[PDB]
Paper text:
Intrigued by the changes in the rotamer conformation of Phe-97, we revisited the mutant HBc-F97L, which is a naturally occurring variant with an immature secretion phenotype. Interestingly, in the absence of TX100, the side chain densities of Leu-97 in chains A and D (L97*) pointed towards the center of the spike similar as Phe-97 in “conformation 1” of wt HBc whereas the densities of Leu-97 in chains B and C pointed towards the side of the spike similar as Phe-97 in “conformation 2” of wt HBc. Thus, the two Leu-97 in a dimer are in different rotamer conformations in the absence of TX100.
The building block of the capsids are dimers of HBc, which consist of an N-terminal alpha-helical assembly domain and a largely unstructured C-terminal domain (CTD). While the ARD is projecting towards the capsid interior, the NTD forms the capsid shell with protruding dimeric spikes that contact the membranous envelope. Instead, most of the mutations with a secretion phenotype map to a hydrophobic pocket in the center of the spikes below the SS-bridge in the rigid part of the assembly domain.
Numbering used by the authors:
A (entry chain D), B (entry chain C), C (entry chain B), D (entry chain A): 1 to 143
Write the structure that this text describes.
């Protein structure tokens, strides 16, 4: 199957490619934001929203990757392989996980429609070449 | 955090640990089933159900894990360590995957409540001594 | 004081005495069933039913007998006596714990009156010599 | 499972640990009290109260510990190991059984609320430094 995780929620993998990969915060920072703002809802037995369901799945996927990294560090004996796998699991997969975390956290905090319009506007800003690019980049905010 | 992926659906990691690990179908079989029965809906841009959202997320997590397996095959030179990582992925993460997929596919097929009652019943059955239980292992059916 | 643990619940040690030893599930299986089916309630601050109260007391009693078994294994350097005590605890006391656990779990699952009628019928069946009874014992089950 | 025997009764293991171990009466004295006051209701086929249910279970747990002690005395011929097991069963497990018996007998006699208030008061008295601790330790009374 060809499943786009954002196709529900009115976005696409291509739209989020407007944002550069180095734009997204670290998984630690994003999980801290999730705990700060939505811990009780995430731990709840309610389907509070599709975003909440998806964020739950993403947090668990990251947790299982961390369990794998620990298991590698304990059960592998070749340090080169140990560290290659650990770094891969921390960086390459972390990128997509923090895309997902960012999208859903931002849509809960600010609104799905607002986030999609931020994506469009930031794509404008970032495609605008530097000579003509304003310094005030689009930024998600309430106030 | 402490997120149980089944409690928003009325179940628990414990309750799915109540069935034996070997009862759960293979990942290949479950993904074939997911495709055959719900590919169009999973690929669609609609929040068809929380089961569908969870299932999309899990299918993509497993896809990234398979991608990890391939990346290891290529960029690892220790065959013992490569085999060890691939086997951890196929077995330990695969079991959690097939529990999750079995649960959500079976919910969509038969009913979430039917599935939870089936878990309880089948666990009690597999624990009852044979001379004092119905002889055939319970099964879900739509016929 | 001469207390019967089932008289409270409409049954009697004499009624459950007709159930053979091979009829009851293991202590581990019964405890896993208790957890899976009624953990939220057993761990709760509510009197949910006399069966729940009794089940809590029985589970904690077994926990203390297991503490005893561990203590024996760690403190007695005479292997014969060590194993003799462990076997007594796991067989003679395990059997009573299994009787009680089965009774209360089955009551919660099926109905106290249903369990009592099942015991009456099972006693009839087991008192009947094999030549003159159906070969399959009566079944208490969800299916 | 992690079951607190007093949660359903408004207390905790933390609150009963306000009392020292050497504060609780002997199992003999507690059983004599239970007989002399509530034998009729404990021997009865009625759920008189959750406390009565729990007391019945405790009484039978102690009966089984006594049976184990007798069986050890008969079936172990290494006096050392016999004595170790008998002492453990009479002392270490006796402690928890007399906590339980004291709690439920005192509840039946005085009120569960009165017993919980007695626990917080004894906490005050025992945490108070000696130079200001009144000789009259708190005590339960009906007058």
């Amino acid at each position: 199957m060809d499943i786009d995780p954002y196709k529900e929620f009115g976005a696409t993998v291509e739209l989020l490619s407007f944002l550069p990969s180095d734009f997204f915060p670290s998984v630690r920072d994003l999980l801290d934001t999730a705990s700060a703002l939505y811990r009780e809802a995430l731990e709840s037995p309610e389907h509070c929203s599709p975003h909440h369901t998806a964020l739950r799945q993403a947090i668990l996927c990251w947790g299982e990757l961390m369990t794998l990294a620990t298991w590698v560090g304990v059960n592998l004996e070749d340090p080169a392989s140990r560290d290659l796998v650990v770094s891969y699991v921390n960086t390459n997969m972390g990128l997509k996980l923090r895309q997902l975390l960012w999208f859903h956290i931002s849509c809960l905090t600010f609104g799905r429609e607002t986030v999609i319009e931020y994506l469009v506007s930031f794509g404008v800003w970032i495609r605008t070449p530097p000579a003509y690019r304003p310094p005030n980049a689009p930024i998600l905010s309430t106030l």
